Design a protein around this ligand. Structure first.
Ligand code: 9CQ
Length: 154
């Protein structure tokens, strides 16, 4: 019982792009860009579409870097999140009524204002490592348990 979601990180040699979500699920947190995958759409095509819709950026090369399964205790549907990375983008990030993008230096990642699991796998993403993770949450702020491992193939 799961649903597909995408998560895209624009990671350049000295900075990473994150977006502050204004409303709905995850509002008030910085995260990468993404969302649900459409019927008849590949996961990578959904990731590209969502990056454009939310950041205003155009991407050509997306690299699969991780898969994270999120469970919220008491919620039947697991979130199967496919994580992607890109260093090659076109355009400038756009602020909209749904999203406020901002560039962060790699030593200034705003972990206190991100989902709490990010503190675990973001250091792997920064060291160009690929991973599989599972995080069990009680509400939106508490990690009850988790698994996280580096993989060669996502
Ligand atoms: C704006 N985005 C990226 C989405 O709407 C899809 C989505 C939403 C939330 C999460 C997510 N990210 C992280 N880092 N931690 C989470 C913890 C629990 C649930 C979702 C989480 C991933 C993709």
């Amino acid at each position: 019982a799961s649903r597909l979601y995408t998560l895209v990180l624009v990671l350049q040699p000295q900075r990473v792009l994150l977006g502050m979500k204004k409303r709905g699920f995850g509002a008030g947190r910085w995260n990468g860009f993404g969302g649900k995958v459409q019927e008849g759409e590949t996961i990578e095509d959904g990731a590209r579409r969502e990056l454009q819709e939310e950041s205003g950026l155009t991407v050509d090369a997306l690299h699969k870097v991780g898969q994270i399964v999120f469970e919220f205790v008491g919620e039947p549907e697991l979130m199967d999140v496919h994580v992607f990375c890109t260093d090659s983008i076109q355009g400038t990030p756009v602020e909209s009524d749904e999203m406020r993008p901002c560039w962060f230096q790699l030593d200034q990642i705003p972990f206190k204002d991100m989902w709490p699991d990010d503190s675990y796998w973001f250091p792997l993403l920064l060291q160009k490592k690929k991973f599989h993770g599972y995080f069990k949450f009680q509400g939106q702020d508490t990690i009850l348990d988790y698994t996280l491992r580096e993989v060669d193939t996502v």
